[PDB]
Amino acid sequence: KITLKTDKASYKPGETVNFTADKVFNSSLIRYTHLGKVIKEETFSGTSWSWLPPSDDFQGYMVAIYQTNTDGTQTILGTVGIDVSSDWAKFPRYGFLSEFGNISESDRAAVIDNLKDYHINGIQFYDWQYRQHQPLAGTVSNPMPVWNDIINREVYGSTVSGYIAQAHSKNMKAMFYNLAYGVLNDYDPNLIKQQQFVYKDANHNDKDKHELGWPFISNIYITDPANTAWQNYLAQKNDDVYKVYDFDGFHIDQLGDRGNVFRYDGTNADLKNAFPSFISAMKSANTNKKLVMNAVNQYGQKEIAGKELDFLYTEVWSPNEGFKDLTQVLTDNAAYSNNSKNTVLAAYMNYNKANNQGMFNTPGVLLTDAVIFAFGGSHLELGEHMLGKEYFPNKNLSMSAELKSSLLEYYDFMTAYQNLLRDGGTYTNPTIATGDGKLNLGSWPPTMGKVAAVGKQVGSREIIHLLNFTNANSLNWRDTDGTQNVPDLIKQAMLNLNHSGKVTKIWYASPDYNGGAAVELSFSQNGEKVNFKVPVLQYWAMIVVE
Numbered sequence: 001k002i003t004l005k006t007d008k009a010s011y012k013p014g015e016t017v018n019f020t021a022d023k024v025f026n027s028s029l030i031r032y033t034h035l036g037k038v039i040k041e042e043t044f045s046g047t048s049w050s051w052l053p054p055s056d057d058f059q060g061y062m063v064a065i066y067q068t069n070t071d072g073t074q075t076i077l078g079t080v081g082i083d084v085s086s087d088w089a090k091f092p093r094y095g096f097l098s099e100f101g102n103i104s105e106s107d108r109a110a111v112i113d114n115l116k117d118y119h120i121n122g123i124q125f126y127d128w129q130y131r132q133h134q135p136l137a138g139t140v141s142n143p144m145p146v147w148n149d150i151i152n153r154e155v156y157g158s159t160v161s162g163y164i165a166q167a168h169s170k171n172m173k174a175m176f177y178n179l180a181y182g183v184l185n186d187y188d189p190n191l192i193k194q195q196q197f198v199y200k201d202a203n204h205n206d207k208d209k210h211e212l213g214w215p216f217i218s219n220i221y222i223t224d225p226a227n228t229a230w231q232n233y234l235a236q237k238n239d240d241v242y243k244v245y246d247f248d249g250f251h252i253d254q255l256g257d258r259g260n261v262f263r264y265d266g267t268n269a270d271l272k273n274a275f276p277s278f279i280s281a282m283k284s285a286n287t288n289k290k291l292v293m294n295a296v297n298q299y300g301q302k303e304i305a306g307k308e309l310d311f312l313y314t315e316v317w318s319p320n321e322g323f324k325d326l327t328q329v330l331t332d333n334a335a336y337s338n339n340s341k342n343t344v345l346a347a348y349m350n351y352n353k354a355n356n357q358g359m360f361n362t363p364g365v366l367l368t369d370a371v372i373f374a375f376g377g378s379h380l381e382l383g384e385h386m387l388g389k390e391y392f393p394n395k396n397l398s399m400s401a402e403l404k405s406s407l408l409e410y411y412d413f414m415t416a417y418q419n420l421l422r423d424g425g426t427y428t429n430p431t432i433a434t435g436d437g438k439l440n441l442g443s444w445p446p447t448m449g450k451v452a453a454v455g456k457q458v459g460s461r462e463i464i465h466l467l468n469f470t471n472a473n474s475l476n477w478r479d480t481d482g483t484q485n486v487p488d489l490i491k492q493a494m495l496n497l498n499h500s501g502k503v504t505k506i507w508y509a510s511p512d513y514n515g516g517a518a519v520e521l522s523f524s525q526n527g528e529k530v531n532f533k534v535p536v537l538q539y540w541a542m543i544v545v546e
């Protein structure tokens with residue numbers, strides 16, 4: 001087998017792809033595919049080589065290397081997915097960074113190169129900032145080169161600048177985290193007045209706040225995002241950030257529904273209705289900078305989904321704990337946006353387990369990504385480590401080597417097949433059955449102890465996703481205690497599909513098999529009944545009928 005990488009996370013139209021393999025195998029071939037069709041083949045020779053993809057924008061490809069056997073069988077050696085996109089917003093693959101102290105350039109490069117290998121196309125820099133009310137440490141004319149952050153940890157400006165430049169070299173976007181409305185207790189009371197805060201009562205008595213303990217320097221006080229004094233103040237803060245640090249945009253966070261809260265004047269703050277004017281103010285102030293905003297458990301999503309955001313973002317909490325609740329967020333977000341935006345989910349796996357050091361439960365993580373990706377979602381989960389908590393610097397849980405390598409196939413798969421997964425089409429009811437009893441099918445939402453079939457019409461293709469819950473001991477996506485089961489492999493499983501058109505080609509791809517390379521399947525057809533066999537199902541397989 002081989003490791004197979006490209007130089008960048010994504011490629012603009014017209015840019016050349018440069019590949020690296022760790023070793024060459026003889027009698028081998030490189031196969032370039034678009035949606036399962038071979039568009040180029042060439043001999044596997046040099047360990048470095050280049051390819052200029054087709055010029056078409058927003059297209060995914062797979063590249064697969066195979067050794068050819070004398071008998072005409074082929075053996076997959078490795079695969080890599082490629083994304084040709086002029087901009088990340090269509091197919092976001094969001095990652096994070098969380099440590100910005102005295103980290104060497106070489107260590108920084110390793111972190112970025114790893115994210116690059118997962119094809120991460122933008123990075124949320126979390127808790128880089130000086131203060132929620134003043135994200136730039138120092139002033140534009142006199143920056144602070146080192147600052148202490150909200151947990152009194154050192155942050156080096158040179159680390160921040162370095163990371164941005166490294167991310168840019170891989171074609172990634174860099175988004176700075178801040179709240180929409182946060183103020184820490186060292187704010188300058190000459191600049192943020194009492195009239196701007198949100199209060200827990202109608203008489204401007206007790207400020208609303210996010211309570212923090214050690215090691216945080218302050219609780220987080222809350223301002224009104226519709227307050228134009230706050231909007232102009234934070235706009236200036238943002239401009240100051242962008243003059244010092246070459247961030248591409250602002251990742252806007254929030255605290256979610258604050259309940260019973262008031263403006264200074266005793267009126268209702270109704271914060272979800274404040275976010276739209278806030279977003280438009282931030283955009284107008286820095287018209288060339290990107291925005292994304294977290295709808296914390298969908299709070300604000302309806303109100304903001306039509307605003308100037310690159311894509312939608314949902315942090316998923318109770319009671320949205322079932323697999324079907326993930327898919328409901330994705331469906332709701334498409335509708336809220338009038339089909340203008342795809343979604344990234346922040347959906348923290350193994351959350352209770354992550355209360356102590358340990359490792360992620362591989363099958364939990366993979367099953368959740370299979371569901372998210374199959375339904376055209378994306379998952380913010382990778383940075384220096386994988387997320388177990390909303391506090392991104394928490395690195396309690398490690399990924400096993402197996403999880404790292406499996407997840408690289410899943411990211412390859414959702415990159416290569418992005419045109420099938422989140423580029424139009426209609427969800428449909430499957431008309432497929434087992435033809436040998438080796439598996440038992442359900443549909444969506446999923447049944448425990450069955451393979452779920454999900455259908456989608458995309459162009460002249462009919463897609464079936466098989467998502468395997470045969471061995472599931474829960475339909476809760478979070479796998480909070482790390483108990484979800486590894487699914488047993490199902491092999492050479494016959495399926496009978498009803499299909500009312502003439503079938504030309506059926507092909508299979510799975511991140512669990514052959515690196516997600518497309519496998520054309522033999523089929524027969526008798527009336528509307530189409531019979532074929534899939535090689536392997538473990539977590540997720542995709543069947544495409546053309």
Ligand SMILES: OC[C@H]1O[C@H](OC[C@H]2O[C@H](OC[C@H]3O[C@H](O)[C@H](O)[C@@H](O)[C@@H]3O)[C@H](O)[C@@H](O)[C@@H]2O)[C@H](O)[C@@H](O)[C@@H]1O
Nearest residue numbers: 127132150179182210212213220253355389390391394
């Ligand atoms: O030991 C307690 C707790 O410690 C970690 O979590 C810390 C802390 O994380 C979140 O709060 C910090 C976060 O607040 C706002 O969002 C700011 O805007 C951010 O800058 C800032 O990072 C969380 O909301 C808190 O409740 C939590 O205390 C661990 O990760 C926890 O598991 C652990 O219980």
Ligand code: NA
Nearest residue numbers: 079080412515
């Ligand atoms: Na691969």
Ligand code: NA
Nearest residue numbers: 098099100384
């Ligand atoms: Na880091």
Ligand code: NA
Nearest residue numbers: 253254255296
């Ligand atoms: Na938040």
